[PDB]
Amino acid sequence: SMGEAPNQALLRILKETEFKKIKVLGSGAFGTVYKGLWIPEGEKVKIPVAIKELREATSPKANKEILDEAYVMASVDNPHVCRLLGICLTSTVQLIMQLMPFGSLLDYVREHKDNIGSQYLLNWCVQIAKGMNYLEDRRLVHRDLAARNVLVKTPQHVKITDFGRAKLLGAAAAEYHAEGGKVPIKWMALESILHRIYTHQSDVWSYGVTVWELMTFGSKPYDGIPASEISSILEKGERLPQPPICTIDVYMIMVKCWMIDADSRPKFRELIIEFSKMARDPQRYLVIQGDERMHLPSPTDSEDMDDVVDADEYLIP
């Protein structure tokens, strides 16, 4: 027998005493994300982390789901994908992840709109396409790509997250079912809404919507339309409108991601190519008032911090 290659990823189990929670970054019914610092055993290193604790969500189903997330996050290794650093098996389990201090890309474009230039937008499109192409190479279909699920390490460096709907293409044929729900309808390809089919090319659709969110500075897709209508809207041939800043060049690429025929949508590798050409001449592809004059940061705050290392530079041997 041989059908798929062995996943030789390492799951690191960390002690409670190696790390400290400093502030809360957010909470839902999934638990609590804390901003923290991880200091590995014997290493003269301080790594800023996000610690996602289940928060006493002692459902055995929720424990299974968050360990499924942990499985995928421990298995990925790419500059544009969030990796898991380790787990801690306290009473409520804790996932230890990299701190992405500027938050989600969605909230970033909403907050910083008047200071984001075309170079940033087009580079973010390249980076998400690189991270999605990596997931495709690993045979992973993400199933929840959206600007909320892209995080910002620096304004110059984004990564995809949220692996709690992700499925391996090659996982028992059952790609006609509501794995993790069937709920992000406004980002979903039509075949996923109607049939529960999911593919790399259905993530291309969601990529198109994600780009549309970036180019509209965080506007809600199909705002005011209930999710019940979306399928019929798409079957009748309507799509999201051309964002004001977008040339027909950029918008036609979005439109191509929303073709009914999945195989006529672009591949992630081609989206990398196309957005990279556009990123060499940004003002030709997005028209933004003030573009010539924009300035986003690169460093951070941080309080004695001499041995701080970012997780991307702390490579496990």
Ligand X SMILES: COC1CCN(c2nccc(Nc3cc4n(C(C)C)c(C)cn4n3)n2)CC1
Say whether 144 is catalytic: yes
Query: How far is it, in rounded angstroms, from Cα 87 to Cα 99?
Result: 15
Separation of CA 147 from chain center: 7
Encoded tokens for 162: 């949220």
Residue selected from 55, 138, 139, 157 as contacting Cl ion according to rule CB under 5 A: 157
Question: Which residue is nearest to ligand X, using beta carbons?
Answer: 50
**What is d(CA 80, CA 126) in angstroms, rounded to the nearest whole number?**
10
**82 is a site residue for ligand X (CB under 6 A):** yes
3-state secondary structure of 20: strand
Nearer to ligand X, 104 or 118 (CB): 104
- Torsion sign, CA atoms 171, 172, 175, 180: negative
Minimum CB–partner distance for residue 139 and ligand X (Å): 21
Work out whether 266 is an interface residue with Cl ion (CB under 5 A): yes
Count of all residues that appear for the chain in the document? 317
Mutual angle of helices 248-256 and 268-279, in 10-degree steps: 170
Name the β-bridge partners of 57: none
Q: Which region among 54-62, 100-108, 185-193, 276-284 touches ligand X (by CB under 6 A)?
A: 100-108
Q: Is residue 267 involved in binding Cl ion (CB under 5 A)? A: no
Task: Name the one range near ligand X by CB under 6 A: 101-109, 113-121, 182-190, 207-215.
Answer: 101-109
Among the options 137, 144, 261, 310, which is catalytic? 144
Any residues with CB less than 8 A from the CB of 300 and at least 6 apart, and which? 101
Please identify, among the stretches 63-71, 134-142, 208-216, 226-234, the one whose residues bind Cl ion according to the rule CB under 5 A: 208-216
* Binding partner of residue 101 among Cl ion, ligand X, none, CB cut-off 5 to 8 Å per kind: ligand X
Residue for token digits 């990796």?
A: 83
Q: Which 6-45 positions form the footprint of ligand X (CB under 6 A)?
A: 25-26, 30, 33
List residues binding ligand X (CB under 6 A).
25-26, 30, 33, 50, 52, 82, 97-101, 103-104, 151, 161-162
Active site residues: 144
